[PDB]
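Quick one - inputs below.
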Amino acid sequence: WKYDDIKKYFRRVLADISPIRDGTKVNLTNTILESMRVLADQQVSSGVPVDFLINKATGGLPNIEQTYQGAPIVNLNDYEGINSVCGFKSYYVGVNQLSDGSYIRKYAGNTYLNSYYVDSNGFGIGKFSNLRVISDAVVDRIHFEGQRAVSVTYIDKKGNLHSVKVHKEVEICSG
Amino acid sequence: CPKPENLEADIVIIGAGAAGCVLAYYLTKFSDLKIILLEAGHTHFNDPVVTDPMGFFGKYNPPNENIRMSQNPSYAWQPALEPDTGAYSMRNVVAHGLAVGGSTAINQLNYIVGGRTVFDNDWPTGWKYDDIKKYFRRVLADISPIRDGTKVNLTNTILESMRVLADQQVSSGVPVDFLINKATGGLPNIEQTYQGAPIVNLNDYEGINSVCGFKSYYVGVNQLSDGSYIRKYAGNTYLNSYYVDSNGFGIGKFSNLRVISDAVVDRIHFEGQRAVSVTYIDKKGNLHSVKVHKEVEICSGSFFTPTILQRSGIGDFSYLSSIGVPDLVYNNPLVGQGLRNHYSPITQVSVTGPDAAAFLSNTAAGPTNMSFRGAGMLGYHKLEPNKPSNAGSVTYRKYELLVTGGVAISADQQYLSGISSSTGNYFALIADDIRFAPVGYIKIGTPNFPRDTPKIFFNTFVNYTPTTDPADQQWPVAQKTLAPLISALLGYDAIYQIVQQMKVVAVNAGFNVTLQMAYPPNDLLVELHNGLNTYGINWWHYFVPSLVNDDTPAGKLFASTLSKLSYYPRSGAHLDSHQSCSCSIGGTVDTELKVIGVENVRVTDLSAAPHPPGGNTWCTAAMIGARATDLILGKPLVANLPPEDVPVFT
Amino acid sequence: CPKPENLEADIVIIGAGAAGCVLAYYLTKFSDLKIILLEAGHTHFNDPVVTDPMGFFGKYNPPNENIRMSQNPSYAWQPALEPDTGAYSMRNVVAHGLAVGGSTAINQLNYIVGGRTVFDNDWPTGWKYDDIKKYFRRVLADISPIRDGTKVNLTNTILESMRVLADQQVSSGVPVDFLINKATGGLPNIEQTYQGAPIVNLNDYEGINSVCGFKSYYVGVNQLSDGSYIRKYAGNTYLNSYYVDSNGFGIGKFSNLRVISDAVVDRIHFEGQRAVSVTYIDKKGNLHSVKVHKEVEICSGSFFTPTILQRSGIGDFSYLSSIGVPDLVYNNPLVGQGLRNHYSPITQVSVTGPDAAAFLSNTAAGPTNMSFRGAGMLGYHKLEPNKPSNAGSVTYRKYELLVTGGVAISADQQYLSGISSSTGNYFALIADDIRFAPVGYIKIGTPNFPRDTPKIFFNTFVNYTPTTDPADQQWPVAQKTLAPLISALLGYDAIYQIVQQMKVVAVNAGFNVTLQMAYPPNDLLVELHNGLNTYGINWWHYFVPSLVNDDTPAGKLFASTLSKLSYYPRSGAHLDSHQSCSCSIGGTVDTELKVIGVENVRVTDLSAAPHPPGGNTWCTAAMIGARATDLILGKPLVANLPPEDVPVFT
Ligand SMILES: Cc1cc2nc3c(=O)[nH]c(=O)nc-3n(C[C@H](O)[C@H](O)[C@H](O)COP(=O)(O)OP(=O)(O)OC[C@H]3O[C@@H](n4cnc5c(N)ncnc54)[C@H](O)[C@@H]3O)c2cc1C
Ligand SMILES: Cc1cc2nc3c(=O)[nH]c(=O)nc-3n(C[C@H](O)[C@H](O)[C@H](O)COP(=O)(O)OP(=O)(O)OC[C@H]3O[C@@H](n4cnc5c(N)ncnc54)[C@H](O)[C@@H]3O)c2cc1C
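Output:
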């Protein structure tokens, strides 16, 4: 689980979402970035090694985003992880703009489980026909034969206990 | 030819509008027949712009597509009418909703039921008021509208003024003024104005009030336990999650009901004189055919019922053959004829005063008043030559009056007049026509598939061209031609003669303010008032100045003033969306709503009305559908269902 | 499933408009492939209102249905665009013809070919002028238009005046006036005015004339041996009784061609990334499926090509999924984007004189001039900030000027202005925009069947709202937003500064008459002229008065005058019917006209143009279809067909 084993997976998820940046300038950001570069200049000198505005993957130059028109953008979530300390101007939020002009929310259920992939009755569609989703089902515990998990029970929206068999493996993603 | 969509049954109802759902619901409730509904539309139960009543005014509109639901091709059909030769050849687009609930999914939610006199004097036998008033009660009970939830002093002032002048109109013995109701007597029918004053119900069960000044309407909204209002419409009530599955099946009680969401119907496959099948296009683009065993019902609205009939084969054989219809069934040259609609010229009022904000408070729109603050329904003006014979003994509904804050003229007129919507010392008054005269017709243009725009002709404010005929016996065609423009001018005068009683009432109601009509211009109204009271019942000779032979400069003044005034109702007005009377009773159908020349099809939407009712035409279509339930079933069941039995809401 | 209508082939061409017939004809002529054309329309070869050119003006109209062919749902599709936020939210209906020959069956018949510079500076590689000019020659040879057959002295006077002032514009060294052509030099490009003066051909083969003042256009009419003119259009020429049977088969040479008259197409059945079939609805209402072997072609016009694409599966996946499209193929968010069209504000001229009838003679419309009497095509005005970089070295076509007798403003404007069409001392001048700036887009609304009105957005004369930003770097968005209104105002000034040379020319041409612009008002133009010549290139700062900071009463005068003048182009104007650029090159298709993301479909009508040409957009669509013939066939055959080979007429 060292960085070079997973950074590809981070790329995968950020590609699956495609966040956006801020769509509005402001001069307070420019002033604050100006000030931070001003004092990071001194923190670069004086030789002390562990101040809060020193990044070792860049060197003598501060990692502070430039402030003027046509200044490039420092990507916080860069692929090779050079920026662990950096002053920027905007984050990456998980919203998309629709053709109409209204933004919506792009989240896990929105993307991976939407009407195109799963039926309203919980079946997957074609490619994903081997998938079942049950909407309102509170799980209680894992029926467990020997050291081998075998079944799971849950309560539907009557209040009934339904038992389902497991053949191969059980996965827990309950937070 | 493997199409497993075999949806053969005995009843098929086409178009789930203000009348389709009522019929389908109460038809599957009271019997065991297999019912199918086709609408070509999904259910907007979750859309904020639909369910929230205030969404009608564009609260959820994306900033790049600021159009509401009547102008949106995803919500409403968009038919445009051919150039109006009376309105400078300006084509207009009026919509019909495209969803479960029809136009009720996109409308302003008002509940005028119409006067009693109209159903007694203008409808066939079996459709007199006492035959249906129970059905009106049924629908208003099924909705349960509410009243305004906010007082305001402008309503009190205006009602004060109307009672003040109705006092004089009660005297002087003239029988046909616009504030005389004969079912009450010497006392005016004007609602009282003080705390603890009772409320006059406009839609009263026994129809006593055909002329009355009130303070609030009845809109079709409900309040939820949370505190938010929602919209209560036809699809909301009769076809909701409690009654129909998401897959279109009914639930238990109504298990014998089928609803298909997106299915545009084309025409009626028709063996002999017996309708046998119907086809439709789903959302692939496939043609599905379904059998009919027992009867076919058409609830596709005013504009699109005659059209589907004509594609089916019923109409004018010469014409349908001309444009290429291959199969012809019955030769009725009246299909799609006799189209009727309302029309509302607009005027606005200026208030001069340093602190008039105190006068105009509590006028903003809430989901209970929807910007409506009155005021009343009036009768014929004293000086209108086009009145029926019964006017001496029965009071008729002519004008529906409305007051609203802000300005409501069109934007170009706003710029032209010099007054805009930003400033806040201005408000609007509307004198709607309920008995609007002009008549038009509908003709299809291509026998291929249901088209959004067929030929629709509607000419309103036409002019009269004199001939060489002697004046004596050409007047009573000038009368018929100039009826609507005369009506609009008289509405202008009626509104005008209210503002002075309003002046007096405001002066001695604790207000030092001044009221004045600035649109149309002040002078152009004072001159009309003087001309009216100096020329009497022959004031309308002067529309055509070549026949009066009055070359006196006063006569030229009158002619010029009427010429200029004729401009405002043409442009500064608003054609309503109350389309009706396309397949009326007698013209195209009998009194049992069956189509002449065939045994097992009926039309039951608002197109089948033989006259436009006394106000907003929503209750009427639902009433027609409800009565159709009884005529189809045979015995009166919905007739004396107890009023405490209402559909449950989800 | 017994449907014997098995019409499987290898090429299917959809929509026989200005480009469909050319392609089908020259495609079955030069090869042996099995060709099919689908149009959804019958052939109006016999209709007097079509074939007679003068029928365009309503000579055969029944007295009760006085509408011509663009407003008739039996002749033309009727799409309406959403409220124009720049034109007081006035929706407009612009038509596309519905017949063999497309819009050419209902159009005004003009043959502007467009300048040379546009195809050199605005089109991709392979579409520069020298690659296509041969195709323009081919189409103009296939039609053989004619010139005006009637002299008139007003043309002589106006050409006289234009040469008079072009003399001065040639001097003074300024490089970008509107009467300077660089391919001629010091001499003006103004046609001579005397008997035996030669004629300057506007549509010249080598494109020397991009700015030139002439006397007549080239309309697409022919004279018959009898003495009557008829209309020569796409269906008339390429698809007539000599080439196709009444049953839709070709004859001999073209025996490998099929044409189906009434067949509305829905979408493209589409296996994998390979189009395989197409379905359509005949005049029963049946769905017929036909196989495609080799390629599919879309020639359904500007408004209805992106629409059929979107129903087919190509577009914005999120949107098409939203409105319920089940099958999705390629995710191109640019389909139906970049819509372009022309626009022509109107002005009219008063002539004061006792015997001015002698001045205005021989101006009536005949089938050879169709009420067009000139006058020329102009370039950029001196004071327009929105000019390309090449303006210093190449001359661009900006305005197309037209003169016509009578008044042509809309009826409401006629009443408002106080001047009507009865009187005969008045005529109209039109300064059309060819480089009109605003851009819009097209979105379908329901995935069921081809609908007449999809969502069409087109906002033209929008306004700029200043922000708190410092003035210095917010100007170059005000420029982009205010381009078209500036262009219209400059067109007004350009027309205005002609009438004085016309005064002088008339005075010493044997005429004691006076010329004056009465619409827009006289004063409101003199003030604009003074403001222009006193404020220079920074005259357009005053559209927004809150940023000029010029509180001098002169500045307030200028702001008020521009405010008032901004009203006329909004209402007193005429949106043209030149829709184009819905699936342009690069945006949606490559330079070989294939649709990105698929291997065997192309779009070849006017929607595929990456820029609107220099004038009326008829030749351009035919040129695109002709070039498509070559690209499909592979080798240039229509390329050097000898010009003496022309289709025979029947
Ligand atoms: C802008 C607007 C304002 C309004 N304001 C008011 C008001 O102030 N007061 C008031 O009381 N009412 C108002 N209304 C409502 C209107 O007056 C009536 O409610 C209307 O006449 C409903 O009658 P209906 O059910 O017969 O028509 P509709 O509700 O239009 O019924 C037609 C139905 O059939 C469907 N349909 C049509 N063609 C086909 C086809 N080919 N195949 C399948 N289905 C089809 C339509 O989608 C629709 O569901 C307004 C409506 C609109 C649009
Ligand atoms: C009012 C008006 C004025 C005009 N004035 C001029 C002028 O002054 N000068 C000039 O040069 N040109 C003029 N034109 C013509 C116009 O500028 C062009 O000729 C037009 O762009 C033709 O290009 P096109 O062939 O691609 O379009 P179209 O000719 O419209 O081609 C579309 C064809 O496809 C058919 N079609 C559409 N949808 C479908 C479908 N779903 N299924 C099957 N078939 C379908 C249509 O019926 C039509 O036959 C005018 C046109 C109009 C309408």
